[PDB]
Design a protein around this ligand. Structure first.
Ligand code: I6W
Ligand code: I77
Ligand code: PXY
Ligand code: PXY
Length: 9
């Protein structure tokens, strides 16, 4: 999950 969001940065 964290990676899924982290792609934004
Ligand atoms: C949430 O975005 C997210 C993305 C990816 C993963 C994840 C966990 C484990 C592996 C892996 O190769 O583990 C080997 C034991 C890859 N990706 N978790 C959460
Ligand atoms: N918000 N995230 C980003 O902007 C971002 C963009 C690119 C990358 C990235 C990481 C690893 C490799 C590689 N070839 O290992 C290439 N690109 N990581 C993060
Ligand atoms: C809830 C969730 C789990 C894993 C990824 C890659 C994305 C979202
Ligand atoms: C964990 C996280 C992901 C994305 C933003 C924009 C901020 C924090």
């Amino acid at each position: 999950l964290a990676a899924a969001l982290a792609q934004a940065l």
